[PDB]
Amino acid sequence: QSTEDLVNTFLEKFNYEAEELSYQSSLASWNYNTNITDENLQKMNNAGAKWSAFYEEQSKLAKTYPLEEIQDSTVKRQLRALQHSGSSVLSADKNQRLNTILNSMSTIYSTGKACLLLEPGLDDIMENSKDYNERLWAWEGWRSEVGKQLRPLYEEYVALKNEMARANNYEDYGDYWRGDYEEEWENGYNYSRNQLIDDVEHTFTQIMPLYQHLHAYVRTKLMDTYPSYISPTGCLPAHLLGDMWGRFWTNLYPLTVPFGQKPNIDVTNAMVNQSWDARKIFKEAEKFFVSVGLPNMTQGFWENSMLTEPSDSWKVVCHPTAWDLGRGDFRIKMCTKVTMDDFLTAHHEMGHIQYDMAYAAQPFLLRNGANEGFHEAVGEIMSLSAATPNHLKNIGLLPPSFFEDSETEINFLLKQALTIVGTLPFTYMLEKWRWMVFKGEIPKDQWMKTWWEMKRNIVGVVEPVPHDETYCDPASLFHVANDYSFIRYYTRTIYQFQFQEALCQIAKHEGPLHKCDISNSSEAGQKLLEMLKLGKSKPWTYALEIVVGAKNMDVRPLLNYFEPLFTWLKEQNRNSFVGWNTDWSPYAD
Amino acid sequence: LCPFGEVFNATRFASVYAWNRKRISNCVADYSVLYNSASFSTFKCYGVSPTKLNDLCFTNVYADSFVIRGDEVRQIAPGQTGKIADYNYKLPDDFTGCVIAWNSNNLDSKVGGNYNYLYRLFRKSNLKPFERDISTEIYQAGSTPCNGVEGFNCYFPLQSYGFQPTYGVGYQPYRVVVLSFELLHAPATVCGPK
Numbered sequence A: 001q002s003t004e005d006l007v008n009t010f011l012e013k014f015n016y017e018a019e020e021l022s023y024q025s026s027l028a029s030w031n032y033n034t035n036i037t038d039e040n041l042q043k044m045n046n047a048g049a050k051w052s053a054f055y056e057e058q059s060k061l062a063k064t065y066p067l068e069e070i071q072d073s074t075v076k077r078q079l080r081a082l083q084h085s086g087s088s089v090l091s092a093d094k095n096q097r098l099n100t101i102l103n104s105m106s107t108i109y110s111t112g113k114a115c116l117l118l119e120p121g122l123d124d125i126m127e128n129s130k131d132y133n134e135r136l137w138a139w140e141g142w143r144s145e146v147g148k149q150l151r152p153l154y155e156e157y158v159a160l161k162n163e164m165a166r167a168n169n170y171e172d173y174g175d176y177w178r179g180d181y182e183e184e185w186e187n188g189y190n191y192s193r194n195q196l197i198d199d200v201e202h203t204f205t206q207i208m209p210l211y212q213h214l215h216a217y218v219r220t221k222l223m224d225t226y227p228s229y230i231s232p233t234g235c236l237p238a239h240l241l242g243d244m245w246g247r248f249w250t251n252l253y254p255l256t257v258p259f260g261q262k263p264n265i266d267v268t269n270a271m272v273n274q275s276w277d278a279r280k281i282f283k284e285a286e287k288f289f290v291s292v293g294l295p296n297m298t299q300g301f302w303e304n305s306m307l308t309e310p311s312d313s314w315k316v317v318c319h320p321t322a323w324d325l326g327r328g329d330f331r332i333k334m335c336t337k338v339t340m341d342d343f344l345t346a347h348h349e350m351g352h353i354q355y356d357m358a359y360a361a362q363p364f365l366l367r368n369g370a371n372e373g374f375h376e377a378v379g380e381i382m383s384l385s386a387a388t389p390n391h392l393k394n395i396g397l398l399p400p401s402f403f404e405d406s407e408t409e410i411n412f413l414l415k416q417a418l419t420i421v422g423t424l425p426f427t428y429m430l431e432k433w434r435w436m437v438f439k440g441e442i443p444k445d446q447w448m449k450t451w452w453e454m455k456r457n458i459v460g461v462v463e464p465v466p467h468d469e470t471y472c473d474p475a476s477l478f479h480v481a482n483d484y485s486f487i488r489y490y491t492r493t494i495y496q497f498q499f500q501e502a503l504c505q506i507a508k509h510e511g512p513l514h515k516c517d518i519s520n521s522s523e524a525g526q527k528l529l530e531m532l533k534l535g536k537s538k539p540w541t542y543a544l545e546i547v548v549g550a551k552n553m554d555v556r557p558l559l560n561y562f563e564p565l566f567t568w569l570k571e572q573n574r575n576s577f578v579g580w581n582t583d584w585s586p587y588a589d
Numbered sequence B: 001l002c003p004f005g006e007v008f009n010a011t012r013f014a015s016v017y018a019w020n021r022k023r024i025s026n027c028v029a030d031y032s033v034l035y036n037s038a039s040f041s042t043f044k045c046y047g048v049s050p051t052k053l054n055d056l057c058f059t060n061v062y063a064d065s066f067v068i069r070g071d072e073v074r075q076i077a078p079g080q081t082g083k084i085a086d087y088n089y090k091l092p093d094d095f096t097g098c099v100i101a102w103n104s105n106n107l108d109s110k111v112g113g114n115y116n117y118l119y120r121l122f123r124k125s126n127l128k129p130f131e132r133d134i135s136t137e138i139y140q141a142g143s144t145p146c147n148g149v150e151g152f153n154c155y156f157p158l159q160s161y162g163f164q165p166t167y168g169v170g171y172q173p174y175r176v177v178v179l180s181f182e183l184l185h186a187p188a189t190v191c192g193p194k
């Protein structure tokens, strides 16, 4: 008769009534993405609406059970997951206004027009064009046309989100996002929300030196294109960052390459010679994942999955995805080609599929990752281990006479660094700005005067043209125009190397870390599937401590990964000046 | 010469809660045709081996045929616990008989969702060995009963499998037939030569 007794019965019904309404929605969503017609949209919408209505009804009617009497550990957290969802209940009249505001704010970004739509033509100028003037006007124009219409709408958005956060006994909307890492346990495995601000603020100081060096070379390797256009002791302009906003530096590689006479490790020609196809690639990936002790792929995987372009004139999107529809259904959707780039994605998706298969035995509410970064971090180490010279030689796609050169290693390390390390200050800065704005500490009348103040101080990027408060820069990002957390990547970047170091140490590899390999080892995969089977049944502190042996993030493994690049680069700074000055302005010398 | 064949290859099978009973008497037993089926995933015979079937025979034999999932096959055994082993069908500890199961996904699936198979997930107490209950009374969870119709804290006691062709392996439909013997005062008739 106790409350726990009623809770158990209420949960044992939900665990089975959710599994159908989830399966129908998953199948409806998959069929539209597979076939694309004018009639499947209605079915998908109907299934989604039914599932959402069922979930919202159950979440509201599950709030009549107090949590204080629950004794079992996992049973309390199942209701914690069920009850917190649906917290966006503040006012019926205001809900429609908020939804209309969100849709209107998202609409302009989708239908953005600039003389060329965002995807076909606007991206090419920022990604490949090397003309100063062409990018100079384009970067300003994208903000001037699309951005200026988004500023007034964003004013009420923050107020409404703050009111919604204060409805649920929170402080600000940022603290609502910060609740994906909050956990309550014994003295040894507890995490409090306000610590997440501090811990990250630690993990950025130790990366401060290395990034500084990465700011130097590029600065002295972009001098050649523009001899007397940018000062050699100031901040890098935003429009010369290889992207519209500056998230990645990966497209500056042709401008800054140390040794252009040595080609990178490419095996596309060897694949062409031997007449490979998609099934061979996926069988090679299956071999890679089974050699490390993990299980194999089910029978239905090869029959129900789509693994090529449909050449029968039907339209598809076929963006690379992996689907766990539910109840034993696993599929992978990707337009396969015969280049080396898809070889990495083959392992990347199989990692997600294996992680999904790992925790199928847990209750329905616990079938997910430990937090918002584990799921993606698991699938990156497989691509890292599948792109090494040793694996390529062992498989057979590479001649046995191939050797390894120091210049090749340096170039590979710089290529990976320009993609990974360069995105951390930007990711941290955006979240810091958003958190401060949500707190409301920053005055509304000086937002730009504050935003650029961060840009020089943190990431060292200076605007080319002065701007007033009319503009609204952050809305230019897709992840900002739509409500989405932006702190996932910072955690995933650290977690992948944190896992890789431990796995390679268990595999007993001798040599530098970046030349590791985890194949032919049934111990590392066995240890990994120890945490992959947990799912969300235990807090992520236990999941982390099972593998690495600690309780918190450490950035030392990432510094150990780039030790050769750091040491080799350190010599080139002797006849140069490292750092930037917050003293120069575009209008005054 | 009783037709064991029609019991196995029958047109329709029943739900787990309404487990059908077939009584066979005054005939002969032919176990070669059952052994040579080559389509049995599980063939666990408990106290049953072809070595000594030709010296002792029984009087009457009971057969039970139903449809279950793929991962619930292991629960049809003496002493097993779970949901189907205490609310639907229990084997007595002193059980002498055979259990046969086979995959039948090709016949009992529909893209839109087959909803003609049911199972019971709530009850007041465990079922006695070889006991059945098809009660439609609304199961009661809390101390306070509800006036014959459900809604809050009251739950209907039956739920249906939504079989579809593209499920996994442990969720695909399976057909199970259990054969048991009796040793009453009737004349021992079911045993044949050669």
Ligand SMILES: *[C@@H]1O[C@H](CO)[C@@H](O[C@@H]2O[C@H](CO)[C@@H](O)[C@H](O)[C@H]2NC(C)=O)[C@H](O)[C@H]1NC(C)=O
Residues within 6 Å of the ligand: A186, A187, A190, A191, A192, A195
């Ligand atoms: C996890 O639990 C520990 C339990 O000791 C918390 O430690 C608290 O630390 C503050 C700061 O010194 C003390 O004033 C408290 O007395 C300590 N105990 C408690 C129960 O608060 C710790 O803050 C918790 N959170 C984290 C992230 O470690």
Ligand SMILES: *[C@@H]1O[C@H](CO)[C@@H](O[C@@H]2O[C@H](CO)[C@@H](O)[C@H](O)[C@H]2NC(C)=O)[C@H](O)[C@H]1NC(C)=O
Residues within 6 Å of the ligand: A272, A273, A274, A275
């Ligand atoms: C695959 O690689 C082999 C490597 O020798 C190629 O072989 C030669 O191809 C030319 C024509 O392109 C022939 O004249 C030669 O006789 C082939 N062999 C030798 C020993 O040189 C081959 O063409 C490549 N492609 C395929 C699909 O076989």
Ligand SMILES: *[C@@H]1O[C@H](CO)[C@@H](O[C@@H]2O[C@H](CO)[C@@H](O)[C@H](O)[C@H]2NC(C)=O)[C@H](O)[C@H]1NC(C)=O
Residues within 6 Å of the ligand: A290, A296, A297
């Ligand atoms: C995973 O499943 C595959 C089949 O999909 C297994 O592959 C077969 O393994 C047997 C082992 O004796 C070989 O004889 C077959 O030729 C293999 N392929 C096929 C097409 O059946 C595989 O062994 C399974 N798991 C493991 C341990 O890798």
Ligand SMILES: *[C@@H]1O[C@H](CO)[C@@H](O[C@@H]2O[C@H](CO)[C@@H](O)[C@H](O)[C@H]2NC(C)=O)[C@H](O)[C@H]1NC(C)=O
Residues within 6 Å of the ligand: B004, B005, B008, B009, B033, B034, B037
């Ligand atoms: C139950 O009915 C099926 C009907 O198909 C029987 O299947 C036959 O099996 C024999 C071999 O035992 C084959 O020679 C036939 O071709 C099959 N089909 C036909 C047309 O009958 C099955 O044998 C029957 N059950 C038992 C236990 O005998």
Ligand SMILES: *[C@@H]1O[C@H](CO)[C@@H](O)[C@H](O)[C@H]1NC(C)=O
Residues within 6 Å of the ligand: A035, A310, A312, A314
């Ligand atoms: C998708 O739908 C069209 C129209 O019904 C049909 O012709 C086609 O076979 C379906 N499947 C594929 C592979 O496009």
Ligand SMILES: [Zn+2]
Residues within 6 Å of the ligand: A348, A352, A376, A379
């Ligand atoms: Zn991924």
